[PDB]
Ligand SMILES: Nc1nc2c(ncn2[C@@H]2O[C@H](COP(=O)(O)OP(=O)(O)O)[C@@H](O)[C@H]2O)c(=O)[nH]1
């Protein structure tokens with residue numbers, strides 16, 4: 001091959017990232033890198049003044065590892081499959097709220113994004129107005145697709161669009 005293009009699936013839990021990726025991939029190669037993170041507490045008896053206070057002092061573990069894991073996830077990423085759930089308004093707003101926080105880098109250093117409304121095969125459950133979603137896409141001048149990981153609707157179409165953005169970005173930047 002000639003190129004290694006790194007893509008990321010972002011979005012809330014239960015949105016369909018893992019199912020979308022497996023739908024598109026159509027193979028079983030999926031190497032995993034897991035770590036443990038945790039919380040805990042300790043206790044101490046303490047007499048205030050009269051009063052017998054019971055102290056719980058909480059703490060966290062494994063955060064350093066988690067950061068390396070996060071960095072490793074974003075390292076050299078060229079496209080984000082930014083997805084939400086058409087049946088979940090909360091998934092849509094979280095995306096919009098997330099986007100409003102991104103800081104622009106130089107044109108070439110900016111990663112491409114495709115906005116993805118997943119679970120298009122359950123119209124009876126839809127919460128996300130189409131017009132609202134297209135406007136978010138319009139706002140940040142990005143493509144928008146309504147996809148289904150179960151049917152395969154626009155799954156291949158959305159990914160190849162992201163590739164095309166990435167590839168056309170290179171042509172200009174090289
Ligand atoms: N009907 C329907 N269900 C989906 C679709 N994509 C994912 N799901 C279901 O939604 C649940 C959450 O999906 P999952 O990929 O595990 O969410 P993730 O946390 O984003 O990775 C799973 O039980 C999937 O079967 C879709 O396009 N249509």
Ligand SMILES: [Mg+2]
Pocket residue numbers: 014016017018019
């Ligand atoms: Mg998942």
